Amino acid sequence: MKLHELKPSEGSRKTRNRVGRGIGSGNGKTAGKGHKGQNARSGGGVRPGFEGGQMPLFQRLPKRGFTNINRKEYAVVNLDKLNGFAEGTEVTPELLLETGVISKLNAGVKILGNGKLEKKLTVKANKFSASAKEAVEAAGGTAEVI
Amino acid sequence: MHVKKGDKVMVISGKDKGKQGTILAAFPKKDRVLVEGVNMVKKHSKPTQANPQGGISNQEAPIHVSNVMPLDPKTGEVTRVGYKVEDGKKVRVAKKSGQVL
Amino acid sequence: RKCVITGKKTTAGNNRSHAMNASKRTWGANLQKVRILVNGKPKKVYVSARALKSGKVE
Amino acid sequence: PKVALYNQNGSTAGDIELNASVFGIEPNESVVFDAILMQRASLRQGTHKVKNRSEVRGGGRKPWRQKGTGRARQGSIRSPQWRGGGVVFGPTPRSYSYKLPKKVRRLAIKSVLSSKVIDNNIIVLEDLTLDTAKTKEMAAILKGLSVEKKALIVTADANEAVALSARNIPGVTVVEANGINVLDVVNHEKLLITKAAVEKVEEVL
RNA sequence: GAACGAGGUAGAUGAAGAGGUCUGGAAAGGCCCGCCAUAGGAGGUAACAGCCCUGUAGUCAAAACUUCGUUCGAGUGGAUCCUGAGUACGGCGGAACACGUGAAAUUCCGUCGGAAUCCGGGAGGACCAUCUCCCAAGGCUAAAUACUCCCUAGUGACCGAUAGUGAACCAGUACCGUGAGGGAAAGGUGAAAAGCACCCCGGAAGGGGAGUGAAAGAGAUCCUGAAACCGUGUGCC
RNA sequence: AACAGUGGUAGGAGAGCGUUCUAAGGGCUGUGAAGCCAGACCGGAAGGACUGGUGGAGCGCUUAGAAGUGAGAAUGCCGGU
Hints:
The structure is cut from a larger assembly and holds chains A, B, C and D. Chain B is an all-beta fold. Chain B has strands at residues 9-11, 23-27, 32-35, 40-44, 56-60, 63-64, 68-70, 81-85, 90-94. Chain B is elongated, with a radius of gyration of 17 Å. In chain C, 0% of the residues lie in helices and 0% in strands. Chains in contact: A-D. Chain B: One of its GO terms (cellular component) is nucleoid.
């Protein structure tokens, strides 16, 4: 790439669809916004979810929400990222962070059971699904619960 | 203003080259120097106070300092100007020699 | 000439009634001066009044 | 990469085969486009400003009646149709920079370096040490390298014999290996490295 | 309270070609050559300059006023007392907290029968116990941070006179308004005033010559000078 | 190459023209640029040159980037008539 011959990959640049310069290109007089509407004036108009006076959809539906303080986003492992390791290695939540397995330890590492293993592993973690407890034992690995 | 009134000024360029001479007057606020011979224009004058002959007078016009360089007192050469101190007052020093003035 | 609960005391402002020759005269502490416990700790000094329901009950 | 090497005198010496991880990639010409428009963007301070309809020192009154009279509506003495005028939209103070991801800017440097290996405008010169900072010595080196155009020198750790020199030469600027400028490597179009800076390039990438 | 060091309020020093030629009114331009550089930022000079000039790099400079920075009372008890007095605490007044008084904490800031005080007190979103955290009701407190009227230095994919500060100019003026206030318009001779002596026309104003300047149609709201518009002539109707 | 279609407002979609400024190259200018003034030139279009006359110092192209991005209508502003 010389400075004399700068060019993009075609499709990574695209000129303006600039609005309101002459009727030749289109969008000249009305400037893309039609005839005399409320949706043509200087910013006056509508909220996003508004229906002109009819009861908007977010109210005629009931409130079924309730949020506790004490919730726990458990870390989600599909049990198949342990196949990236070899058998007989250490499985700790401090190890799952820096290996790129879990990007964020949100106070709890639960191990799910989709898929399968073939590797005897020293698995210690906070909580376990029931099929994951047997799948680690199916590979002969230990199933310590932190 | 690196040139003193009454030196041996050489004219660099302008309407007249070649001629050298002496300063008759100076204008350091306007950065212009009046030198004999060069930049002589024929000026009209009305018959008024200070000798009402009128007519077309004859005098020289001032020249900007950048056309003005002094010659060498050692060779007769257009040299640049430096500065030294010789027992007291700062003196002008011509380049390409150990000359003064 | 004060207490510790809302910002209105011996201060400096306005009034224009009649007969019309004028300067400085008073808003004072509106006392009728007896105990409370919103702070039960005594000397029996000044009181003023913006509102007196739900000071306390008893 | 089998790039040749010369001396500080300029005589031909033993070459260096470079590393294909840095100098032997394919030239990714799509990245180099969007590489330079990052660095060109954050050389503009953009401190331009225009007084709007409000910052106009006046305005205010309906300059006459609205009816009874003859003119148009014309409802303040500094509206944008007027001659004194507040510009309608105008330019406002801002930035222009945006930090590209790290995997781009690693690859963006390397494709330029791998290109200049093919373009052969690159010479490694170990131990560029000088007695004085005189650019006359610097000019003698450049004519000894047959460089009559723009050029760039990568020092190891900004040796002041090189650094105080060559700032007076127009086509040659001095920079250290910590400051490998993605514009200037493309800009100066011929390039010089010290041998200590060669591994200093290699130790970071 | 004294001495030193650095900075500021004036400064100084400072490299290398009228290089030869060609056009041009005029070389800094073109051509053919040199040269300096810790200086090829910038301005100025008859036009576009590293080496033409002021100056810039670099290094030094302060009588005096200053500015910043350097140097000349521990432990152990466990009798007693104290540890913040006219306030701290809640459910019905107000206000600030994201919280519109609600389940309403908490902080204070006007107000309705006057708690304790170390075996104590307060808080942990009413409250209750438990549990951990902490002694409120006296005061002081730098840095990081908010900002520009000026100053110093210098930037710009900022403006180039209807733009940019209202104001590039005697501009917050001239004028409008008794009034608070409102608030304009208007930069360019050349490189050098060398700015027109002299002769005619007329009372001039104003020309026509001449002379000045490379250009005088360049000559005084003075570069370029379009269109509206006012024209004078003439080809065809 | 063959076949087919091409009126269009609101309205969507795609290509390009051009001014100001910057960016590397290149060049072109006191042997006369920008502008202005004329024509019978070329490009499908916005358009773009080329001589001639004015003017007396700067400005185009090729590819990029940024936009105060282009007038003929606002009982439009401001001059000139």
